[PDB]
Design a protein around this ligand. Structure first.
Ligand code: K0I
Ligand code: FE2
Ligand code: ZN
Length: 443
C-alpha cells in the first residue's frame, strides 16, 4: 500500500515568528506524528552552524575523544551480508577511539579522494564514522552550547518543560549534547531512544542525511524480526530490510534531512540514519510533560528490567522529583504519576516492615542535595531510598549500593550488610499526599 509509505510530517519555517508559534511544539509532541522534520530551522533562528563545523571543532578541542565505528559502505538503503549473497539485518561494527583532529583529517581526505575518483553484491569498501563526541563540558564548548539556547524552549537541552531537566543530574548524551562526524555511508543502526525519550537532531552540513522511521506501535514487529534472526533488539546493531517490513505491513517513513533541518524523533519511534554526504550532526533528548511520554518511558523502564539492561533514566527518582516540583495539570499524566508513586511507596513500606520484623536495623543516612539516583552494583536495577551496603563498604564510606535481592543472594540473613535510608517515611508520605491535580483551563 501507499499507507506503507506515508508522507513525512514536515513544518517549513521562514522566521522567528514561525519558530516560536505554539502549534509547532504541539505538532511535534502529538503521538500521531512519529517524527517531525522542521525544515529551515537554523536559518529561521539565525543559528550559527559554523560553530559545529569540523574546522571550528578542531580549533576548539583538537584532542577531544571520538568513538570510531568502522563500517562497510553499503548500497542505497540495503544491507548485504559480508559475502554479498543476501540481504540481512545484522550489521556489526568494530569500535576504537581517535581524536577530533585525527577524525577531521580523515573526513577531509575522504572528500578529496572522492573528487579525484570523480575525475578518473560488493565487496564493499570500509569507512569510519565518528560517533558519540561528548559536548557536556561548558568550559570547553561555551559558544557551542550557548548557540543552542536560541532554540524554542520545548526543544532546548534544558527547560522547565523537559522531564530530563527534572531528573536533577547529568545523564550523559541525554541531557547533554553529542556530536557525530560523518562521511558518506556512515550508518546509525536501528533503535529506540533510551527509555523511549524524544530526541532532537540538527544536521550541521554541508551534506545531507537520509532517515528511516517506524512508529512506536510497530516496535514489537521489529523486536520479533530480531528474535527470529538471533539478534538482540536493544543491544545488537541491525539495519532493517525494507522488503521484510513492507511484507509485514509495517509503514516506513523516509526523508532527507538537509543542513539546518531539525528532526524531532517522537517518543519510542524506531529509527535508523545514513549520511548521504559529508556532514556533522548534533543531538540530545527531551522529555515533554505528556501522558504519552511518561507512559512509554515507564514501559521501557520495566521492559529493561526483564531484558537485564540498565535504564539510563531513573524513573523512580524522576517521579518523586516531579511530585516535589511540578504542578501537573493534565489529568491523564497526573493519574499515571500518582499510580507509580503509590506502587513505589507501598513496595518500600512492605520491605521496610519486613526488615524491621526480622530485627534488622535501618540506619538514617540522608542524602546530599544534587546526589544522583542509585543503581545496584550487581544487577543495575534502580535502587530507591533503602540502600543495601556491605559492612566493609559502610566502614570505608564507599557506600557501594546493592538492591535487596542481590544483597540477600550474597548474604542470606543480611548479616554482611547494613541498610541505609535516604528519605524519611513521613516525608515521602507528605510529598505523595500533597501531589494533587492542578487546575488548568487550557487543552
Ligand atoms: O546519526 C545521527 O545523526 C544520530 C545518531 N544517534 C545515535 C548514534 C549512536 N551510536 C553511533 C552509531 C552506531 C554505529 C554503529 C554501531 C553502533 C552505533 C550506536 C552508537 N547511538 C545512539 C543511541 C544509543 C543508545 C540509545 C539511544 N541512541 N544514537
Ligand atoms: Fe539514538
Ligand atoms: Zn541487584
Amino acid at each position: 500500500k501507499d499507507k506503507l509509505n506515508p508522507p513525512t510530517p514536515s513544518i517549513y519555517l521562514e522566521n522567528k515568528r514561525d519558530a516560536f508559534f505554539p502549534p509547532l511544539h504541539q505538532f511535534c509532541t502529538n503521538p500521531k506524528n512519529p517524527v517531525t522534520v522542521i525544515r529551515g530551522l537554523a536559518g529561521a533562528l539565525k543559528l550559527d552552524l559554523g560553530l559545529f563545523s569540523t574546522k571550528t571543532l578542531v580549533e576548539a578541542n583538537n584532542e577531544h575523544m571520538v568513538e570510531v565505528r568502522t563500517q562497510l559502505l553499503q548500497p542505497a538503503d540495503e544491507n548485504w551480508d559480508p559475502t554479498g549473497t543476501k540481504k540481512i539485518w545484522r550489521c556489526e561494527s568494530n569500535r576504537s577511539h581517535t581524536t577530533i583532529a585525527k577524525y577531521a583529517q580523515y573526513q577531509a581526505s575522504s572528500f578529496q579522494e572522492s573528487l579525484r575518483e570523480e575525475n578518473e553484491k560488493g565487496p564493499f569498501k570500509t569507512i569510519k564514522f565518528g560517533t558519540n563526541i561528548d559536548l557536556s563540558d561548558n568550559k570547553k564548548w561555551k559558544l557551542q552550547l550557548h548557540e543552542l539556547t536560541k532554540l524554542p524552549a520545548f526543544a532546548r537541552v534544558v527547560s522547565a518543560g523537559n522531564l530530563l531537566t527534572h531528573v536533577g543530574h547529568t545523564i550523559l548524551g541525554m541531557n547533554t549534547v553529542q556530536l557525530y562526524m560523518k562521511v558518506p555511508g556512515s550508518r546509525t543502526p536501528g533503535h529506540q531512544e533510551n527509555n523511549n525519550f524524544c530526541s532532537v537532531n540538527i544536521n550541521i552540513g554541508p551534506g545531507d542525511c537520509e532517515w528511516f522511521v517506524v512508529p512506536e506501535d510497530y516496535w514489537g514487529v521489529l523486536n520479533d524480526f530480531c528474535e527470529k534472526n538471533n539478534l538482540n533488539f536493544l543491544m545488537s546493531s541491525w539495519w532493517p530490510n525494507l522488503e521484510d517490513l513492507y511484507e509485514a505491513n509495517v509503514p516506513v517513513y523516509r526523508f532527507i534531512q538537509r543542513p539546518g533541518d531539525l528532526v524531532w524523533i517522537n517518543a519510542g519511534t524506531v529509527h535508523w540514519v545514513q549520511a548521504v554526504g559529508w556532514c556533522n550532526n548534533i543531538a540530545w533528548n527531551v522529555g515533554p510533560l505528556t501522558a504519552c511520554q511518561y507512559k512509554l518511558a515507564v514501559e521501557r523502564y520495566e521492559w529493561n528490567k526483564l531484558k537485564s539492561v540498565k535504564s539510563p533514566v531513573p524513573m523512580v527518582h524522576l517521579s518523586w522529583n516531579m511530585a516535589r516540583n511540578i504542578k501537573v495539570s493534565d489529568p491523564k499524566l497526573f493519574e499515571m504519576i500518582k499510580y507509580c508513586l503509590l506502587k513505589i511507596l507501598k513496595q518500600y513500606q512492605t520491605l521496610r516492615e519486613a526488615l524491621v520484623a526480622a530485627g534488622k536495623e535501618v540506619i538514617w543516612h540522608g542524602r546530599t542535595n544534587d546526589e544522583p539516583a542509585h543503581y545496584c552494583s550487581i544487577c543495575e536495577v534502580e535502587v530507591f531510598n533503602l540502600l543495601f551496603v556491605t559492612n566493609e563498604s559502610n566502614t570505608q564510606k564507599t557506600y557501594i549500593v546493592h538492591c535487596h535481592d542481590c544483597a540477600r543472594k550474597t548474604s542470606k540473613s543480611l548479616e554482611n550488610f547494613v541498610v541505609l535510608e535516604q528519605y524519611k517515611m513521613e516525608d515521602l508520605i507528605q510529598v505523595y499526599d500533597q501531589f494533587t491535580l492542578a487546575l488548568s483551563l487550557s487543552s
